[PDB]
Amino acid sequence: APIEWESSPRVEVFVGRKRELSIIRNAKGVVVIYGIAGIGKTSLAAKAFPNAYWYNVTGLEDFKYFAWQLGLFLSSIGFEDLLEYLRGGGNNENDIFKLITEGIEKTGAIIIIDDFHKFQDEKVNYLLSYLAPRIKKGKVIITTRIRPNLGNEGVTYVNLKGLNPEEAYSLAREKEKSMTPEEFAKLYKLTFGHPLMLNLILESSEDTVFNFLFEEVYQMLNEEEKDLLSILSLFDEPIEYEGIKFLYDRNPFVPLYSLMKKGLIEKKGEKYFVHDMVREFVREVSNQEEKEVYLRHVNFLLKSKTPINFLRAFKYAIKVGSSELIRNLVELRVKEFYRIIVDFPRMYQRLLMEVEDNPYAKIEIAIIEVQRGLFEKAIKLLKEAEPYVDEFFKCEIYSWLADAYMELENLEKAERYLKKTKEIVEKINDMYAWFSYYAEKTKYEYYKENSREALKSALKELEIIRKIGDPEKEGLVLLHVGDIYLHMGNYEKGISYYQEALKMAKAYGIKFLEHISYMELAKGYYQLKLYEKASEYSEKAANYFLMIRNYRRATDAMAYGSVSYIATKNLEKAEKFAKEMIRIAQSTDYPLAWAGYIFLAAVDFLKGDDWREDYNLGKAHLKEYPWLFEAVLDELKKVFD
Ligand SMILES: Nc1ncnc2c1ncn2[C@@H]1O[C@H](COP(=O)(O)OP(=O)(O)O)[C@@H](O)[C@H]1O
């Protein structure tokens, strides 16, 4: 079913070591199952708890993507739906560590992690922030090839020693009882308890050395079995069946289940991929047709059209060695990957840096370093990859170059670089190029005191967005135009623009943009001194950013909220807001947050309390002595009351 857990079914035959199961089931904190390939760890993890959330890790793994997929799980349970996932769409921090800890502290679901990946310290650093508190309800189990060095505090290290001879003799009899029990004593002379390698011999026939043991079994395979293995071994990720069937231009069913009977291929529900021990031995039997096979798989994932399948197609488009494939792909990266390049930067970074020499890769790498603040490296790469790009990419280079010079207080050089794009979007009449053209043009004028030309450049910008059909970017402009008109002194255009954007946010179920417009709706009514409505919409926006832990805007919400509230409403609610502004002030030291401390004094003076309780003015004014911005916020409090 769509949008569900990847709970892989266990093996048909299994004679678990019951002591190690009671170890895992009654363990505290995190259970570490480390062994060799095919030793039985993954199958043992399934034997522990069936309905546990499974996450099979692959090569490409950004910590934010895993927590995103882990956040999708916590959102499906319903306890971290409002907190975890909605903050994933917000931003990122190490506060994610305490969110997921609080996640299975509330949900209590048991989670299992299979294998090990790159950037292991980032994942190890999260793992060590959860094993120690010992959550009374949740549990996390991992299966690794090595001991992750997580310490022995709240960790149960489980080293799998294969299978007992008595259980192994039972294993062959639980598959073929009529087979002579003497022969099983000789099988232990070959596998030494290895459960997977035992299934290989039980499903085959015919002394060989350990390496030849698998290699002389590799010759027992059929024609289509060797071809299917020698192709599926080139993929480090599980694949669907139609993805496999289109991968061969030939029906792959009969070798699939046959190798499945022998344990060479494992299925995690719907997908299939070879075992890690099978992959390490047959990836060298045929490495000539990698380009053709990878090319077909790129086109299949291109038909999937999902951000994760987007990245999977990017990894194998590097192994084909075609700069033309990377050309057309980065075009589709601006179509749909554009929205989540800020979501998965480190993942996308590792795939792009794999081809640093590619000019188109130098483009998106500069975009990452644009968001990371290193504008020098961005412009540098934007000059190196300048000639090779086409006329379509030539526009996007100068648009980001204009955005690059925008954050350097360089409007003149940003104007002449966006002047280079005045003729490209009109001559090629591309929709996507026309979008980024007027997008950076609005930002160019917004940086200037002028707020007039930005009003018309954003209008024709919306004309392009109404054609593609992406709701997120269409709501972002409607909210932003509902801000330039407010700075112009106009009120009717502002209130109607982010109210229709709220009509958009409510329609598509976007809770992030929904509470962003709530902050714009409350601020607009504050400028008109409509105390009632301005204070209400600020209450729901403040509840959001306090829950999403975006205390910067959460402070801005309760600031105008506490002001407009006491104007015509009760003093206690704004006192609650002011006291919470103190709690988040004493944690983040935000300037406008200490402005709520004196708003508490405003409540105290209006609540019949003395100047000792009105001394809170002096309590935060010495805190607000360095910041000269405090001399500005006083114009709001004395005017309304
Ligand atoms: N108790 C068992 N009984 C029978 N086969 C087993 C048992 N434990 C493991 N196996 C075999 O080993 C395989 C699982 O190996 P495993 O070490 O878990 O792989 P990985 O962790 O690399 O995915 C199973 O598919 C099966 O063939």
Numbering used by the authors: 102 to 307, 314 to 748
Task: List sentences from the manuscript.
Signal transduction ATPases with numerous domains (STAND) are a family of AAA+ related ATPases involved in a wide range of cellular activities. The hallmark of STAND ATPases is a conserved core called nucleotide-binding oligomerization domain (NOD), which is responsible for nucleotide binding and protein oligomerization. In most cases, the NOD is followed by an arm domain and a non-conserved sensor domain made of repeated motifs, which was found to contain the primary inducer-binding site in several instances. PH0952 is a predicted transcription factor with a TPR sensor domain and a putative N-terminal ArsR-like DNA-binding effector domain.
Native crystals of PH0952 lacking its N-terminal effector domain belonged to space group P65 and diffracted X-rays to 3.4 Å. The asymmetric unit contained four protein molecules with RMSD values lower than 0.38 Å among 641 αC atoms. Each PH0952ΔN molecule exhibits a curled up conformation in the shape of the letter G, with 90 × 60 × 40 Å3 dimensions. In the putative nucleotide-binding site, a ligand was clearly visible in the experimental electron density map and was interpreted as an ADP molecule (present in the buffer). The domain organization of the protein is that of a bona fide STAND protein in the monomeric resting state, consistent with the presence of a diphosphate nucleotide. It comprises a NOD module with three domains: the three-layered α/β nucleotide-binding domain (NBD, amino acids 102–262), the helical domain (HD, amino -acids 263–316) and the winged-helix domain (WHD, amino acids 317–393). The NOD is followed by an arm domain (also named HD2, amino acids 394–496) and a sensor domain (amino -acids 497–748) composed of tetratricopeptide repeats. The buried surface area between the arm and the NBD of PH0952 is 490 Å2, consistent with the key role of the arm in the STAND autoinhibition process. Finally, the PH0952 TPR sensor caps the tip of the NBD that is formed by helices ISM (α3), ISMb (α4) and H2 (α5), burying a surface of 360 Å, similar to the NBD–WHD and NBD–arm interfaces. Thus, the NBD is clamped between the arm and the sensor domain, suggesting that in the crystal, PH0952 is autoinhibited by NBD–arm and NBD–sensor interactions.
